[PDB]
Amino acid sequence: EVETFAFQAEIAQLMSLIINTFYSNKEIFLRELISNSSDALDKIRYESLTDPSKLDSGKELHINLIPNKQDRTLTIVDTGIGMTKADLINNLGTIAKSGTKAFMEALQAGADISMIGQFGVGFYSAYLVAEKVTVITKHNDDEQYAWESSAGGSFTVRTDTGEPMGRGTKVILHLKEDQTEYLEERRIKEIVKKHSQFIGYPITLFVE
């Protein structure tokens, strides 16, 4: 069973601009995804200081980059905390809450403020290079979910029956035909060095 959701109006407008722009500096999509992987890895790591059991779903904390020229996909896999179904719907489309209003609400509720920024908006830059994005994600004590969109104003969420992940997030970028440089080892190495060199987790490029 598949559920379809509309992007919030301003996010839909942003995605339309991203899809139709000739913006030159497209390589920064990778920085934005690796940065969210690193934040997800920090989260399961800090959380495992008070609850060591949260790493039963996988001890290693890392990021893998997997180009596939046959499928024309670039996959980014991390073993971070992963996303719940609510995280997918709320943060990857339907809600755009200001950090300030979220901060006020957290103060009044006595809740922590660590998520007042959601996951940001920089990751929509993936549509500079991808015509479709699939996200497979697995959070502890929740099921494995697949999120998908080709940026036509909507996205889908379904329970994933594919290969189990353990814990974390996998972003599959189905690249546009003119953006296949991001499957080239030399190009990926270059942009990791320029924009993601100081991430505090191993970033491993898989060779085809």
Ligand SMILES: C[C@](O)(CCCc1ccccc1)c1cc(C(=O)N2Cc3ccc(F)cc3C2)ccc1O
């Ligand atoms: C959002 C993404 O950036 C997915 C975006 C795909 C997409 C691309 C383009 C358009 C829509 C969606 C992303 C999310 C995650 C994840 O599991 N997080 C994030 C985070 C930050 C802090 C935190 F404390 C806990 C978590 C959980 C990992 C890698 C990612 O890369």
